[PDB]
Amino acid sequence: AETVSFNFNSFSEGNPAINFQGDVTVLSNGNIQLTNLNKVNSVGRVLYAMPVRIWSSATGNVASFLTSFSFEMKDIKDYDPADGIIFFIAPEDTQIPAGSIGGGTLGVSDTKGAGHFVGVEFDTYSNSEYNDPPTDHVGIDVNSVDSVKTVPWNSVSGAVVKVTVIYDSSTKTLSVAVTNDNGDITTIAQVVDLKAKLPERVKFGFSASGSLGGRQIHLIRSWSFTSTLITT
Amino acid sequence: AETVSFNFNSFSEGNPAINFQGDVTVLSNGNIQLTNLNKVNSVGRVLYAMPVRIWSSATGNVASFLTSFSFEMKDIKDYDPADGIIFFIAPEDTQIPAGSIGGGTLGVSDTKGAGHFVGVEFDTYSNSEYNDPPTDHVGIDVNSVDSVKTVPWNSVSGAVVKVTVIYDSSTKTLSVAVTNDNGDITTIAQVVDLKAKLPERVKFGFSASGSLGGRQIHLIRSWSFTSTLITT
Amino acid sequence: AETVSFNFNSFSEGNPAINFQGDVTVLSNGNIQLTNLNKVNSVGRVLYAMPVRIWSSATGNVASFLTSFSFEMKDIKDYDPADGIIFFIAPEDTQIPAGSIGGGTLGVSDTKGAGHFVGVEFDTYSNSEYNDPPTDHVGIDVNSVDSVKTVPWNSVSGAVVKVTVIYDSSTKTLSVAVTNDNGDITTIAQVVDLKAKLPERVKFGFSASGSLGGRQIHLIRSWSFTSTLITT
Amino acid sequence: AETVSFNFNSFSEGNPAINFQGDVTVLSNGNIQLTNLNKVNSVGRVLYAMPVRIWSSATGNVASFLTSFSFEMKDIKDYDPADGIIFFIAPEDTQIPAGSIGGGTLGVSDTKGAGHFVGVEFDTYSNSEYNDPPTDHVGIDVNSVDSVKTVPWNSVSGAVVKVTVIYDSSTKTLSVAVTNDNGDITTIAQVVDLKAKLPERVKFGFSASGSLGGRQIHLIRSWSFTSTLITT
Ligand SMILES: CO[C@H]1O[C@H](Cn2cc(CSC[C@H]3O[C@@H](S[C@@H]4O[C@H](CO)[C@H](O)[C@H](O)[C@H]4O)[C@H](O)[C@@H](O)[C@@H]3O)nn2)[C@@H](O)[C@H](O)[C@H]1O
Ligand SMILES: CO[C@H]1O[C@H](Cn2cc(CSC[C@H]3O[C@@H](S[C@@H]4O[C@H](CO)[C@H](O)[C@H](O)[C@H]4O)[C@H](O)[C@@H](O)[C@@H]3O)nn2)[C@@H](O)[C@H](O)[C@H]1O
Ligand SMILES: CO[C@H]1O[C@H](Cn2cc(CSC[C@H]3O[C@@H](S[C@@H]4O[C@H](CO)[C@H](O)[C@H](O)[C@H]4O)[C@H](O)[C@@H](O)[C@@H]3O)nn2)[C@@H](O)[C@H](O)[C@H]1O
Ligand SMILES: CO[C@H]1O[C@H](Cn2cc(CSC[C@H]3O[C@@H](S[C@@H]4O[C@H](CO)[C@H](O)[C@H](O)[C@H]4O)[C@H](O)[C@@H](O)[C@@H]3O)nn2)[C@@H](O)[C@H](O)[C@H]1O
Ligand SMILES: [Ca+2]
Ligand SMILES: [Ca+2]
Ligand SMILES: [Ca+2]
Ligand SMILES: [Ca+2]
Ligand SMILES: [Mn+2]
Ligand SMILES: [Mn+2]
Ligand SMILES: [Mn+2]
Ligand SMILES: [Mn+2]
C-alpha cells in the first residue's frame, strides 16, 4: 500500500514542505496567519508541497484518508469578522484564482463561486450570492462555495477549534467532526466521489479570505494527515 | 445542547466512571486487560458507567459522537491468537450473554451470533459459523457478529493501534479510521440508524473473548469520547 | 491520575448525567428551577449522577477540584424571598432528609440544622435557630447549616451571580469567589478536611428550599467542574 | 468598597492600559509574546498600567481578588524549552532587574534569585541554584524564585493552559487552579500576607525569560481581573 503521512505541531517560513500562496505569513509562535489584516480582498493559502495520489489510473483504486487540524478565528476592531477558512483539495497546479475578489469566494473560487476543488469550509459570513445559510456554518463544497451541504455552527472569537476528517474510499463518504470551545461537537457528512471530481494527484491545504470591510485573524495552529491507497 | 465528554489516558480499579464485567483486570501500567489468559471461553467487558442519551423521543433528535481509543493485541505462547476486541453500544442494562461461549461471539452475542448492540469489531479469527471473511478484519456489526460490512485488516502482535470513530446523526453514518503500526490507515463506513436499532439510553464500551484453544492479550490503553444531542 | 470533568451551558430533563431530587424542574430556556413556588416547605436538589472519588483509602491521596457555576434568585409577589441555594458535597447515597421542613435547612439538614455534607451556601434569610448573621451571607458549611464561617453578601433579585470554587487538597483549603451584579467580588475561604468529613465516593450538587411564607425562584444557569485524584 | 475590574480578550501594543517592558511584542493575532527567540538572556514583561490599591494604611483592610488568564508555551527547534512564565505582583515602580541574566530568574529577580514581588510561576526548567524540584512545576513565590511551595506539573508544547487565582484577604490565602490540555486540574495554595510583603499600591502582570541555550515561545492569550477593597 501507498501511504502519505505527516505531522505539523508548528509551521516555519524556511520550510520547503509547505507552499505559501498570496497573503499568508508565519507568526513567531509557529502559527500560519492566512490573511493580511491591512489589505483589501486579502487571500492567503497554504498547501502541503508534495502531491498526493488519491487514485490510481492503473488499478482504479481510491485512497482513504484521516486528517486532523486546529485553527483559530479572532475578531479585530472595526471590521466585520469574515470570511472564514476552507480546508481544501485541488489539482496539483492550484493557484489563487486570477483577480480574486476574496470575501465569500474563500480564496478558492471565481466571482460566481465556481472553482476546481473539494473542501470543508468554516464559513463566518452569510453571502446570499452563494446561497449561504443565515448563520455561521460548516459546509462540504464540491467545485463551488454554494455548498452541497451545510450544518449550523458558531465561530467563537479567539477559540481554538479542533477538526477531524475521515474520507472512506469504499462508500465515498467525507465525514467531519468539529470540536468547539464550549466542548460540543458538530458533525457533517456527505458522499463525494473524489475519483470523479479531482485528478490522480492533488494538493491538500487551507485557504482564507477577506473583503474591504470583512476581515478577521485566520490562524492554522496544527495539522496531521495520513492517506493510504491500496496498490493491488 | 446536551454533551457527554470524557477522557482516559489510563485506567484504575475503583474508578466509578468504569463498569467492569467478567474477566477484566487493570494492569499496574494503567492498561485494561479484557480476557483472562488461564480461563476457557474468557469474556471481559468495560463500560462507561453513565448511560448516554443517544436520541430523544420528545424531539426525534439523534446525537452525533466523536471517539478515539488505542488498543493492543499480543500473541501468547501455544494458544491461537484469538478472538478480538469489539467497541460496542448497547442498552444500559447490558450484561455478558448468559452461558457465553466467548470465542467468535466477542462477548456480545449468543452462540448463533445474535445480540442487542451496535459495534466496531477488530476480529483476529475467521469463524465460518458467523460468515467471517478469510483474514483479520474490521467489521461494522448490527445486532450480530455476522457483520453488515467488513474490510481486510492485519492485527500485528504487540502493536499499538489507534482508532477514530465519527457518528454523524443527520446521515446516520458510522465512519471508522484505524491507524496501524506500519503507518497505513484502514477505513470502514456504514449507514446505521441508532434510533431504530437502540434505546434512548445506552452504554458504550469494549468487549473481548477467547475460547479453549484461542487466547491472546487484549488491552485497552486509552479512550476519549464526546457526544452532542441537539435539545430543541 | 483520575479526572472527572463536565460542562453544562444549559440543562434538560431526562439527561442521565443529572439526578433530580424533590421539587426540581427544567425550564424551556434550559435553566434548572430548584423549588416549587406553590408548595409548602419546597425542597429541590440536583446532583451530578456519577459518584466522584474525592480520596483513596489505599494511597491516602485527596483530590483537588475547580468548579464554576451561575445562579439567579428572584422575588415573587406576596412571599418573603427565602431561603437560598447551597452548593454541596455529600455521600453518594444522599437524599433529601426524610420529613424535611425545607426553610433554613436548605434541603441538606434536619430540623436541628445537622446533616452529612460540606457546602457553600448563598443564604437569603436570617434563621436565629441556625445562628445566621443578620444580613444575606455566603457561608461555608461542615455537617451543619450553622456555618463554620460566613461573609456578608447581598442577594439581588433577578441578578445573575457567578461563583468559582477551588479545593486545594494539599492545604485542605476550600476557596470561594462570588461575582455580584454591581461588579464587586466577595470571597470566603476555610480549611476543610474532606477526607475526615466525607466518604471516599461522593456526589456534588445544588439544593434549595422554602417554607410556608418564604418562597422565591431559585435557578441554576450553568455548571462546569474538574476534579483530579493522584493515583498509585 | 473600592473595586478594580478589567478584561482582555486580546492585547495591543498601542493601548495605554498595559505597560510593556523589555523584549515583549504583540502578535497580529493579539497574543503577547514575552521573550525574543533570537536574543541571549531575553526578558519580557507586561503590567496593567494602573496601580491597584491592595491594602490601606488608614483602615488596615486588605483587598480580595479573582483573576483568570490563559497562556501557551511552545518548543522551538535546537533550543531547550526554558525558562517559564510568572504571574506577579510588585511595587508600582517595578522594572526588569538591572543587568538581568534572564534564565531561572524569570525576569523578576537578581542572580541570587531574590527580588521584591509575590508570584505564581509556571516553571519549565530545573535550576539547582534556586532549589527547583526535578520536573516542571507551578510555584508560589514570595520575594524569591526559590519557591515557598511547588506542585509537580507538565508544560505541554503548543497547549493552551487556563489559570484561575483567588486571593482571600481574611485567611491571606492565595489559591491557584491550573487546567491542562489532557483535562486534569493542578492546584496549589499558600498563605501569603500581602500587606506585610507588598506596598499599598501594586502593579500586576506577567514576566518570562530565556538564556543562551534555553528558549521557548511564551504567550499570554487573555486576562480577566477583579479586586475589591473594603473602604469601611
Ligand atoms: C445594477 O448593477 C450594478 O450595480 C450593482 C449595485 N450595487 C452593489 C451594491 C453594494 S454590494 C454589497 C456590500 O458588499 C460589501 S463586500 C462583503 O463584505 C462582507 C463583510 O461585511 C463579506 O466579506 C462578504 O464576503 C463580502 O462580499 C461591500 O464592501 C459593501 O460596500 C457593499 O455595500 N449596491 N448596489 C452592482 O452589484 C453591479 O455589479 C452593477 O453592475
Ligand atoms: C453432529 O453434531 C454434533 O457434533 C458436532 C461435531 N463436531 C464439532 C467439532 C469440532 S468444533 C471446531 C473446533 O473449534 C474450536 S473453538 C474455536 O477456537 C478458535 C481458536 O483456534 C477461536 O477462538 C474460535 O472463536 C473458536 O470457536 C475447539 O476448541 C476445537 O476443539 C474444535 O475442534 N467436531 N465435530 C457439534 O458441532 C454439534 O454441536 C453436535 O450436535
Ligand atoms: C413552647 O413551645 C411550643 O410553641 C413554640 C411556639 N411558637 C412558634 C412560633 C412561630 S415560629 C416562627 C415563624 O416562622 C415561620 S417559618 C420561616 O419563614 C421564613 C420566611 O419568612 C424562612 O423561610 C425561614 O427559613 C422559616 O423558618 C412561620 O411560617 C411563621 O408562621 C412563624 O410565625 N410562635 N410560637 C414552638 O416553636 C414549639 O415547637 C412548641 O413546642
Ligand atoms: C569556579 O567558579 C568559576 O567558574 C564557575 C564554573 N562553571 C560554570 C559552568 C557552566 S554553568 C551551567 C550551564 O548553564 C547554562 S544557562 C541555563 O540554561 C538553561 C537551559 O538549558 C536554563 O535557561 C537556565 O535558566 C540557565 O541557567 C549555560 O548556557 C551553559 O553553557 C552552562 O554549561 N561550568 N563551570 C562559574 O560558575 C563561576 O561564576 C566562576 O567564578
Ligand atoms: Ca460566506
Ligand atoms: Ca471471528
Ligand atoms: Ca438561613
Ligand atoms: Ca527554574
Ligand atoms: Mn458557506
Ligand atoms: Mn468478524
Ligand atoms: Mn446561613
Ligand atoms: Mn521554580
Side-chain angles (χ1 to χ4, degrees):
Chain A
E2 192 169 284
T3 290
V4 178
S5 186
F6 58 84
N7 180 228
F8 292 101
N9 295 307
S10 50
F11 307 92
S12 47
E13 294 195 348
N15 191 349
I18 304 141
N19 289 291
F20 299 95
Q21 299 187 335
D23 300 331
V24 182
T25 55
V26 173
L27 299 179
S28 46
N29 68 1
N31 292 169
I32 285 163
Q33 166 173 144
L34 290 166
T35 57
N36 184 324
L37 276 3
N38 292 281
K39 222 178 132 298
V40 178
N41 299 170
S42 176
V43 177
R45 332 199 304 187
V46 293
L47 297 154
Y48 183 71
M50 192 178 293
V52 174
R53 187 132 151 272
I54 53 164
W55 61 267
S56 165
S57 56
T59 63
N61 291 166
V62 183
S64 282
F65 65 79
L66 165 72
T67 185
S68 287
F69 54 90
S70 66
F71 71 78
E72 161 187 341
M73 286 184 280
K74 196 151 175 213
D75 287 5
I76 57 151
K77 204 187 177 164
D78 321 295
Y79 288 97
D80 201 351
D83 274 87
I85 308 173
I86 188 187
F87 164 68
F88 74 109
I89 324 166
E92 63 207 302
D93 73 329
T94 190
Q95 293 293 143
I96 294 167
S100 178
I101 63 149
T105 73
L106 301 174
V108 292
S109 74
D110 58 25
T111 301
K112 300 197 281 114
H116 196 180
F117 68 96
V118 169
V120 181
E121 54 165 65
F122 301 89
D123 196 344
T124 69
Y125 181 93
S126 189
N127 301 86
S128 60
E129 63 271 28
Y130 308 131
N131 291 303
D132 268 340
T135 73
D136 295 350
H137 50 285
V138 181
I140 288 174
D141 295 354
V142 180
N143 294 325
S144 183
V145 285
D146 186 344
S147 303
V148 171
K149 207 213 224 105
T150 67
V151 63
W153 173 65
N154 178 215
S155 188
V156 177
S157 186
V160 177
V161 182
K162 293 195 270 168
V163 183
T164 291
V165 182
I166 304 167
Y167 183 72
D168 176 62
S169 67
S170 179
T171 61
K172 295 167 177 183
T173 305
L174 189 63
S175 184
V176 186
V178 187
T179 306
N180 297 291
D181 172 67
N182 78 357
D184 290 2
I185 57 150
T186 308
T187 66
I188 189 175
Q190 176 62 49
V191 166
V192 180
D193 191 347
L194 294 195
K195 191 177 201 80
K197 304 289 181 199
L198 286 158
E200 252 199 285
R201 292 193 169 92
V202 288
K203 273 181 194 191
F204 285 87
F206 303 96
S207 185
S209 59
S211 60
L212 190 132
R215 304 177 195 183
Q216 73 196 151
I217 290 181
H218 300 99
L219 294 170
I220 307 298
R221 298 175 51 92
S222 65
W223 188 24
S224 79
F225 180 102
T226 318
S227 67
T228 299
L229 174 70
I230 285 142
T231 51
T232 188
Chain B
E2 172 168 300
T3 171
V4 180
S5 203
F6 58 83
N7 177 230
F8 293 101
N9 294 308
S10 61
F11 306 95
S12 94
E13 300 180 5
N15 188 339
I18 307 292
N19 292 148
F20 299 94
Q21 298 188 333
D23 300 332
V24 176
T25 56
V26 173
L27 300 181
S28 49
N29 68 2
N31 288 181
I32 281 174
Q33 182 179 131
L34 298 169
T35 60
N36 183 323
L37 279 359
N38 292 282
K39 220 176 129 170
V40 177
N41 298 170
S42 176
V43 177
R45 332 200 303 188
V46 293
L47 296 156
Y48 184 70
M50 187 176 58
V52 174
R53 187 179 163 218
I54 49 148
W55 68 267
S56 161
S57 56
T59 62
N61 295 165
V62 183
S64 289
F65 67 77
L66 168 67
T67 190
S68 287
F69 53 89
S70 71
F71 71 77
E72 179 196 328
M73 285 181 282
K74 197 162 182 299
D75 296 0
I76 63 173
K77 174 99 162 315
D78 310 302
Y79 304 92
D80 194 0
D83 276 90
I85 303 182
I86 188 176
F87 164 68
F88 73 108
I89 325 167
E92 67 196 305
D93 72 331
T94 192
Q95 292 294 145
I96 294 168
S100 178
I101 63 148
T105 76
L106 301 173
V108 293
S109 73
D110 58 25
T111 302
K112 299 195 284 300
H116 195 179
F117 67 96
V118 169
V120 183
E121 57 160 67
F122 303 89
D123 196 350
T124 76
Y125 182 87
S126 187
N127 294 90
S128 57
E129 65 269 30
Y130 307 133
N131 293 302
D132 268 340
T135 75
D136 297 350
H137 55 283
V138 181
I140 288 177
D141 293 355
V142 182
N143 295 323
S144 183
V145 284
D146 186 344
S147 302
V148 168
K149 206 213 225 105
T150 65
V151 62
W153 174 65
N154 177 216
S155 186
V156 175
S157 185
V160 178
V161 182
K162 291 183 182 78
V163 183
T164 291
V165 183
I166 303 163
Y167 184 71
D168 176 64
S169 69
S170 180
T171 62
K172 296 165 182 74
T173 304
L174 187 63
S175 185
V176 186
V178 186
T179 305
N180 296 290
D181 171 65
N182 86 137
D184 293 19
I185 52 116
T186 305
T187 68
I188 190 174
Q190 177 61 50
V191 166
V192 183
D193 189 349
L194 294 191
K195 186 182 197 198
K197 303 289 180 194
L198 283 166
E200 284 167 82
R201 293 162 51 130
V202 295
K203 273 181 195 193
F204 284 86
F206 301 92
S207 178
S209 61
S211 61
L212 189 141
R215 306 189 198 175
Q216 70 196 154
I217 293 166
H218 301 98
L219 293 175
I220 305 311
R221 299 164 50 84
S222 61
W223 190 20
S224 64
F225 177 98
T226 305
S227 66
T228 299
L229 175 58
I230 289 310
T231 53
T232 199
Chain C
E2 191 170 285
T3 290
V4 176
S5 174
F6 56 84
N7 176 215
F8 293 99
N9 294 309
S10 68
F11 301 97
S12 49
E13 300 180 356
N15 187 344
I18 298 295
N19 290 147
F20 298 93
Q21 297 188 336
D23 300 332
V24 189
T25 58
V26 172
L27 298 180
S28 50
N29 67 3
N31 291 178
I32 279 172
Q33 179 181 126
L34 292 172
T35 61
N36 183 326
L37 278 2
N38 291 282
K39 219 177 130 169
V40 177
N41 296 172
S42 176
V43 177
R45 332 200 302 186
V46 293
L47 295 156
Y48 184 70
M50 192 176 287
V52 174
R53 190 175 163 226
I54 52 149
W55 66 270
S56 164
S57 52
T59 63
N61 296 163
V62 182
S64 281
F65 64 79
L66 166 72
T67 186
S68 286
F69 52 89
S70 65
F71 69 74
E72 183 188 324
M73 282 181 282
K74 197 162 175 194
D75 303 357
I76 65 172
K77 200 202 164 338
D78 309 305
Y79 301 90
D80 186 14
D83 273 89
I85 304 173
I86 189 173
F87 165 67
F88 75 107
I89 329 157
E92 65 153 64
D93 74 330
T94 192
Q95 295 291 145
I96 293 167
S100 177
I101 64 148
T105 73
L106 303 173
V108 293
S109 73
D110 58 25
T111 302
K112 299 195 177 287
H116 194 180
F117 67 95
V118 169
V120 182
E121 45 162 80
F122 302 90
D123 199 343
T124 76
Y125 187 84
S126 188
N127 291 96
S128 59
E129 65 269 29
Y130 307 132
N131 291 302
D132 268 339
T135 74
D136 299 345
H137 55 280
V138 181
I140 288 187
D141 294 355
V142 180
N143 292 326
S144 184
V145 284
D146 184 345
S147 302
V148 169
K149 206 212 223 106
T150 64
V151 62
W153 173 66
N154 179 214
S155 186
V156 174
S157 183
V160 177
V161 182
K162 290 191 228 163
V163 183
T164 291
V165 183
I166 302 167
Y167 184 71
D168 177 63
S169 68
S170 177
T171 61
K172 296 165 182 74
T173 306
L174 187 65
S175 185
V176 187
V178 187
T179 304
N180 306 312
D181 102 288
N182 89 136
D184 296 17
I185 189 88
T186 306
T187 66
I188 190 175
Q190 177 61 48
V191 166
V192 179
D193 189 350
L194 294 189
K195 186 184 195 193
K197 304 289 181 196
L198 282 163
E200 283 162 285
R201 287 177 156 226
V202 295
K203 273 180 194 192
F204 284 87
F206 303 93
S207 182
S209 60
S211 63
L212 189 136
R215 306 184 200 182
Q216 67 193 167
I217 298 169
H218 302 101
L219 294 173
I220 307 307
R221 291 170 62 91
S222 62
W223 188 22
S224 58
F225 173 97
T226 316
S227 203
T228 298
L229 180 69
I230 297 305
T231 49
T232 181
Chain D
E2 194 169 284
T3 289
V4 177
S5 185
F6 61 79
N7 176 230
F8 291 102
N9 294 309
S10 77
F11 300 103
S12 73
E13 212 151 11
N15 208 260
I18 296 288
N19 291 148
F20 298 93
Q21 298 188 334
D23 311 330
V24 170
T25 55
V26 172
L27 313 177
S28 43
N29 71 358
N31 295 181
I32 283 168
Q33 176 175 140
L34 300 172
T35 61
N36 184 323
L37 277 4
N38 351 110
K39 221 175 257 174
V40 177
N41 299 170
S42 176
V43 177
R45 332 199 303 187
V46 96
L47 298 155
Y48 184 70
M50 187 181 57
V52 177
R53 189 153 77 118
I54 53 158
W55 67 271
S56 170
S57 52
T59 62
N61 295 164
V62 182
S64 280
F65 64 79
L66 166 74
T67 186
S68 286
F69 54 86
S70 56
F71 72 71
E72 181 190 336
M73 283 182 281
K74 197 157 170 200
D75 300 2
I76 60 182
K77 285 282 172 192
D78 318 307
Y79 303 101
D80 214 332
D83 277 85
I85 301 164
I86 184 184
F87 163 68
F88 74 109
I89 325 167
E92 65 205 302
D93 72 330
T94 191
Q95 293 293 145
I96 294 167
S100 177
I101 63 147
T105 73
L106 303 173
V108 292
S109 74
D110 58 25
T111 302
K112 301 202 187 294
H116 194 183
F117 68 95
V118 170
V120 181
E121 55 164 69
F122 300 90
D123 198 347
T124 72
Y125 182 90
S126 187
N127 294 91
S128 60
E129 65 270 29
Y130 308 132
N131 292 302
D132 268 340
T135 74
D136 296 351
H137 54 281
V138 181
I140 283 163
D141 294 355
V142 180
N143 294 325
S144 184
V145 285
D146 185 344
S147 303
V148 170
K149 207 212 224 106
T150 66
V151 63
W153 174 65
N154 176 216
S155 188
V156 177
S157 186
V160 176
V161 183
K162 291 195 274 171
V163 183
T164 291
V165 182
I166 304 166
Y167 184 73
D168 176 63
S169 69
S170 178
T171 63
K172 297 167 180 71
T173 304
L174 188 66
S175 204
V176 186
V178 186
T179 305
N180 296 293
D181 172 69
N182 89 134
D184 294 19
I185 188 90
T186 304
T187 69
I188 190 174
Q190 178 60 50
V191 166
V192 180
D193 189 349
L194 294 185
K195 185 160 70 170
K197 303 292 180 197
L198 292 173
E200 291 161 75
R201 297 170 88 214
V202 293
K203 272 181 195 192
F204 284 86
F206 298 93
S207 160
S209 69
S211 63
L212 201 201
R215 296 171 215 190
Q216 82 194 138
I217 283 136
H218 299 103
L219 295 167
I220 304 307
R221 297 178 50 99
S222 64
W223 185 23
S224 75
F225 174 97
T226 317
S227 65
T228 299
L229 173 65
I230 290 151
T231 50
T232 186

